[PDB]
Motif scaffolding. Structure first.
Motif, PDB file in Angstrom:
ATOM      1  N   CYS A 210       0.854  -1.186   0.000  1.00  0.00           N
ATOM      2  CA  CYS A 210       0.000   0.000   0.000  1.00  0.00           C
ATOM      3  C   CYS A 210       0.890   1.236   0.000  1.00  0.00           C
ATOM      4  O   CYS A 210       2.117   1.133   0.248  1.00  0.00           O
ATOM      5  CB  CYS A 210      -0.932  -0.013   1.173  1.00  0.00           C
ATOM      6  SG  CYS A 210      -0.095  -0.013   2.756  1.00  0.00           S
ATOM      7  N   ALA A 211       0.293   2.395  -0.284  1.00  0.00           N
ATOM      8  CA  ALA A 211       1.072   3.655  -0.360  1.00  0.00           C
ATOM      9  C   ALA A 211       0.150   4.906  -0.305  1.00  0.00           C
ATOM     10  O   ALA A 211      -0.976   4.865  -0.766  1.00  0.00           O
ATOM     11  CB  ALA A 211       1.921   3.684  -1.609  1.00  0.00           C
ATOM     12  N   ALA A 212       0.660   5.980   0.272  1.00  0.00           N
ATOM     13  CA  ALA A 212      -0.021   7.253   0.271  1.00  0.00           C
ATOM     14  C   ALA A 212       0.930   8.439   0.545  1.00  0.00           C
ATOM     15  O   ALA A 212       1.972   8.304   1.204  1.00  0.00           O
ATOM     16  CB  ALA A 212      -1.130   7.247   1.293  1.00  0.00           C
ATOM     17  N   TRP A 213       0.497   9.614   0.102  1.00  0.00           N
ATOM     18  CA  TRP A 213       1.168  10.830   0.524  1.00  0.00           C
ATOM     19  C   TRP A 213       1.018  11.053   2.037  1.00  0.00           C
ATOM     20  O   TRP A 213       0.002  10.738   2.625  1.00  0.00           O
ATOM     21  CB  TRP A 213       0.625  12.019  -0.256  1.00  0.00           C
ATOM     22  CG  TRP A 213       1.399  13.292  -0.123  1.00  0.00           C
ATOM     23  CD1 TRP A 213       1.044  14.383   0.587  1.00  0.00           C
ATOM     24  CD2 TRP A 213       2.630  13.609  -0.776  1.00  0.00           C
ATOM     25  NE1 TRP A 213       1.981  15.394   0.424  1.00  0.00           N
ATOM     26  CE2 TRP A 213       2.973  14.941  -0.398  1.00  0.00           C
ATOM     27  CE3 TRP A 213       3.488  12.906  -1.636  1.00  0.00           C
ATOM     28  CZ2 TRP A 213       4.106  15.546  -0.824  1.00  0.00           C
ATOM     29  CZ3 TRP A 213       4.639  13.545  -2.081  1.00  0.00           C
ATOM     30  CH2 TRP A 213       4.932  14.840  -1.672  1.00  0.00           C
ATOM     31  N   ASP A 214       2.044  11.643   2.647  1.00  0.00           N
ATOM     32  CA  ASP A 214       2.015  11.995   4.024  1.00  0.00           C
ATOM     33  C   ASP A 214       2.194  13.505   4.136  1.00  0.00           C
ATOM     34  O   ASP A 214       3.255  14.036   3.723  1.00  0.00           O
ATOM     35  CB  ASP A 214       3.089  11.283   4.833  1.00  0.00           C
ATOM     36  CG  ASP A 214       2.993  11.656   6.304  1.00  0.00           C
ATOM     37  OD1 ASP A 214       3.559  12.709   6.715  1.00  0.00           O
ATOM     38  OD2 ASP A 214       2.330  10.910   7.054  1.00  0.00           O
ATOM     39  N   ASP A 215       1.203  14.180   4.735  1.00  0.00           N
ATOM     40  CA  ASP A 215       1.222  15.656   4.847  1.00  0.00           C
ATOM     41  C   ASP A 215       2.301  16.184   5.776  1.00  0.00           C
ATOM     42  O   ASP A 215       2.721  17.315   5.615  1.00  0.00           O
ATOM     43  CB  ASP A 215      -0.120  16.231   5.360  1.00  0.00           C
ATOM     44  CG  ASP A 215      -1.304  15.859   4.505  1.00  0.00           C
ATOM     45  OD1 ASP A 215      -1.150  15.543   3.322  1.00  0.00           O
ATOM     46  OD2 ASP A 215      -2.434  15.918   5.038  1.00  0.00           O
ATOM     47  N   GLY A 216       2.740  15.394   6.747  1.00  0.00           N
ATOM     48  CA  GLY A 216       3.719  15.829   7.713  1.00  0.00           C
ATOM     49  C   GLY A 216       5.138  15.829   7.167  1.00  0.00           C
ATOM     50  O   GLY A 216       5.906  16.741   7.438  1.00  0.00           O
ATOM     51  N   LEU A 217       5.504  14.741   6.494  1.00  0.00           N
ATOM     52  CA  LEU A 217       6.767  14.610   5.771  1.00  0.00           C
ATOM     53  C   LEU A 217       6.790  15.417   4.461  1.00  0.00           C
ATOM     54  O   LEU A 217       7.844  15.716   3.971  1.00  0.00           O
ATOM     55  CB  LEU A 217       7.004  13.118   5.414  1.00  0.00           C
ATOM     56  CG  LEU A 217       7.144  12.168   6.592  1.00  0.00           C
ATOM     57  CD1 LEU A 217       7.114  10.705   6.165  1.00  0.00           C
ATOM     58  CD2 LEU A 217       8.441  12.453   7.353  1.00  0.00           C
ATOM     59  N   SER A 218       5.634  15.752   3.900  1.00  0.00           N
ATOM     60  CA  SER A 218       5.546  16.217   2.514  1.00  0.00           C
ATOM     61  C   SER A 218       6.297  15.244   1.576  1.00  0.00           C
ATOM     62  O   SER A 218       7.205  15.614   0.857  1.00  0.00           O
ATOM     63  CB  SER A 218       6.056  17.678   2.362  1.00  0.00           C
ATOM     64  OG  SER A 218       5.565  18.167   1.116  1.00  0.00           O
ATOM     65  N   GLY A 219       5.919  13.971   1.651  1.00  0.00           N
ATOM     66  CA  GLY A 219       6.553  12.910   0.882  1.00  0.00           C
ATOM     67  C   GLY A 219       5.648  11.681   0.813  1.00  0.00           C
ATOM     68  O   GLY A 219       4.657  11.565   1.555  1.00  0.00           O
ATOM     69  N   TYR A 220       5.990  10.766  -0.072  1.00  0.00           N
ATOM     70  CA  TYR A 220       5.121   9.648  -0.384  1.00  0.00           C
ATOM     71  C   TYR A 220       5.671   8.488   0.383  1.00  0.00           C
ATOM     72  O   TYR A 220       6.881   8.244   0.341  1.00  0.00           O
ATOM     73  CB  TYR A 220       5.167   9.353  -1.875  1.00  0.00           C
ATOM     74  CG  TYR A 220       4.044   8.465  -2.389  1.00  0.00           C
ATOM     75  CD1 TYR A 220       2.726   8.889  -2.361  1.00  0.00           C
ATOM     76  CD2 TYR A 220       4.318   7.241  -2.969  1.00  0.00           C
ATOM     77  CE1 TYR A 220       1.711   8.110  -2.872  1.00  0.00           C
ATOM     78  CE2 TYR A 220       3.309   6.429  -3.475  1.00  0.00           C
ATOM     79  CZ  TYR A 220       1.999   6.866  -3.437  1.00  0.00           C
ATOM     80  OH  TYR A 220       0.981   6.049  -3.925  1.00  0.00           O
ATOM     81  N   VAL A 221       4.788   7.742   1.006  1.00  0.00           N
ATOM     82  CA  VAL A 221       5.191   6.640   1.877  1.00  0.00           C
ATOM     83  C   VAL A 221       4.575   5.331   1.433  1.00  0.00           C
ATOM     84  O   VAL A 221       3.411   5.266   1.056  1.00  0.00           O
ATOM     85  CB  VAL A 221       4.924   6.920   3.369  1.00  0.00           C
ATOM     86  CG1 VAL A 221       5.627   8.224   3.787  1.00  0.00           C
ATOM     87  CG2 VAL A 221       3.471   7.014   3.688  1.00  0.00           C
TER      88      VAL A 221
END
Ligand SMILES: Cc1ccc(S(=O)(=O)N(C)CC(=O)N2CCN(c3ccccn3)CC2)cc1
Length: 233
Positions: A210-221
């Motif tokens: 699975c995968a999603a953008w992360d607003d805290g890192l400003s990066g894709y996880v």
């Protein structure tokens, strides 16, 4: 639509490497380009991405000041440079083309076959290490996150067969790309997402991420990944 990545390379520690990704059957200017690496036998790790028409880019925190991403709009070529190479940087480096399909107007992504770079930990979403079933059964694979990722952002699922690039299985939590059969389905609620596979077939044996953008890192996880075994039992 096609992606040519430069050839495999062996590098000494402390050198830098510049990988290219050339697109075909189109510019290029209506899309974005992401870079994702995978060390041998390990998970998927986002490096950064760029939107060519804007000339802007964003880089994963753990590589800040080491990755440089650039684009030549006229030649439809994107480049990723990684400096200060170490053993840990040994990996397959994938070029990913993403955006909106012409006409139909929905999300798509396409991965290149990758460039092997041989020389000489980051936040991930939580997935069970393994799952299994026999042909015709059902299975569910879970993906747990928090507010800043799954809670507020669209979840994708990727299938990786051994020796192949990842491939999009689900986008926007629950949407199927054309070609993916209806026995695959996705769902998400709160900070959790799930991939359900009906009528298990031996060819479904693979790793699922699975995968999603992360607003805290400003990066894709990415998630840790789940190996699904189909027991021809
Ligand atoms: C100023 C600036 C310029 C460019 C970018 S960006 O290329 O990283 N990008 C469009 C962000 C984004 O929403 N992504 C990229 C990561 N995503 C990926 C990456 C790989 C596979 C699947 N999905 C999709 C969402 C960020 C900020």
């Amino acid at each position: 639509v096609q992606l040519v990545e430069s050839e495999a390379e062996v590098k000494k520690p402390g050198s830098s490497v510049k990988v290219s990704c050339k697109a075909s059957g189109g510019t290029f200017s209506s899309y974005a380009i992401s870079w994702v690496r995978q060390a041998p036998g390990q998970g998927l790790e986002w490096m950064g991405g760029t939107i060519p028409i804007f000339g802007t880019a964003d880089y994963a925190q753990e590589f800040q000041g080491r990755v440089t991403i650039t684009t030549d709009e006229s030649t439809s070529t994107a480049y990723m440079e990684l400096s200060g190479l170490r053993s840990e940087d040994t990996a397959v480096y994938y070029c990913v083309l993403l955006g909106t399909t012409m006409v139909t107007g929905h999300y798509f992504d396409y991965w290149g076959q990758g460039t092997l770079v041989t020389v000489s930990s980051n936040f991930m979403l939580t997935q069970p290490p393994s799952a299994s079933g026999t042909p015709g059964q059902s299975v569910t694979i879970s993906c747990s996150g928090s507010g800043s990722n799954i809670g507020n952002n669209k979840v994708n699922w990727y299938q990786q067969l051994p020796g192949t690039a990842p491939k999009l299985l689900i986008y926007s939590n629950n949407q199927r790309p054309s070609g993916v059969p209806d026995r695959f389905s996705g769902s998400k609620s709160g900070t959790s997402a799930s991939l359900a596979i009906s009528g298990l077939q031996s060819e479904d044996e693979a790793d699922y991420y699975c995968a999603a953008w992360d607003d805290g890192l400003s990066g894709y996880v990415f998630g840790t990944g789940t190996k699904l075994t189909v027991l021809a039992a």
